[PDB]
Design a protein around this ligand. Structure first.
Ligand SMILES: CCCC[C@@H](N)[C@H](O)C(=O)N[C@@H](CO)C(=O)N[C@@H](CC(C)C)C(=O)OC
Ligand SMILES: [Co+2]
Ligand SMILES: [Co+2]
Ligand code: NA
Length: 263
């Protein structure tokens, strides 16, 4: 019950993933001590709207009030950009971007570490990305989604950290969230066998504490229950004939765009 994208389709995703990636590239200089999350959102949307000639998929999505999600430190996901929340030395910050261009969505996020790094967030953010990369390397036709989740979770826990269970990566294309669900863990519920032309995200959330999370009274903001740090990276990809292609790759990613398992 998963759409297989045509070559036209795939290329529209290329463009949409690139624009989403470039939002995250454009915003980096602004991710600085003193800056508010509200203005980062304004910058991102202005860019998406005026220069990208695109839309944010997030705005209005289940009533979501801003254009990107900005999650700071213990906030796991769906943190709401707010003119009064200021970035400070030490912070680890996720900005999650999704744009729609030409019928198609690109969906991506990364961690920024604000001003003077702290130490254990340096590590959480690193491990969380390494966990995304190891999943991206497994992706190829005929492998099962379940191996991928099981393999993320192993890595993450072996570090002292946990995988958040409530939120998962997702098929993506003309719909924001299409099949399949891409769990970052082993559940025997999961059985998807991958095939060229599927497009989906992988977006593990990792807590330096324990795996349990909590939603706030704004009905959006998810925090860790034990108030530890949590980190997330996300890429949108296409299954290729012999591996994958990352459609949201940034200049700062240290994994190649084209991952090929062929001889
Ligand atoms: C408004 C935000 C965000 C979307 C994305 N950039 C993120 O990659 C995502 O798709 N998140 C999903 C993955 O499970 C998600 O968090 N969806 C929520 C939907 C709410 C809008 C109700 C969910 O399914 O919670 C159980
Ligand atoms: Co996202
Ligand atoms: Co997503
Ligand atoms: Na966080």
């Amino acid at each position: 019950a998963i759409s297989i994208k045509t070559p036209e389709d795939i290329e529209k995703m290329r463009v949409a993933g690139r624009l989403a990636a470039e939002v995250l590239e454009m915003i980096e200089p602004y991710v600085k001590p003193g800056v508010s999350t509200g203005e980062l959102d304004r910058i991102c949307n202005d860019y998406i709207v005026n220069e990208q000639h695109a839309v944010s998929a997030c705005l209005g999505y289940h009533g979501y009030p801003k254009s990107v999600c900005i999650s700071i430190n213990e906030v796991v996901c769906h943190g709401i950009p707010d003119d009064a929340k200021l970035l400070k030395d030490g912070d680890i910050v996720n900005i999650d971007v999704t744009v729609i261009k030409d019928g198609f969505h690109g969906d991506t996020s990364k961690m920024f570490i604000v001003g003077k790094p702290t130490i254990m967030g340096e590590r959480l953010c690193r491990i969380t990305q390494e966990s995304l990369y190891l999943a991206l390397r497994m992706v190829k036709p005929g492998i099962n989604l379940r191996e991928i989740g099981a393999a993320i979770q192993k890595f993450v826990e072996a570090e002292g950290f946990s995988v958040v269970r409530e939120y998962c990566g997702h098929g993506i294309g003309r719909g924001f969230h299409e099949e399949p669900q891409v769990l970052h863990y082993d559940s025997r519920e999961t059985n998807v066998v991958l095939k060229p032309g599927m497009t989906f995200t992988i977006e593990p959330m990792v807590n330096a504490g324990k795996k349990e999370i909590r939603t706030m009274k704004d009905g959006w903001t998810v925090k860790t229950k034990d108030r530890s740090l949590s980190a997330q990276y996300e890429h949108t990809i296409v299954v290729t004939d012999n591996g994958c292609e990352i459609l949201t790759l940034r200049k700062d990613d240290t994994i190649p765009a084209i991952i090929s398992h062929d001889e």
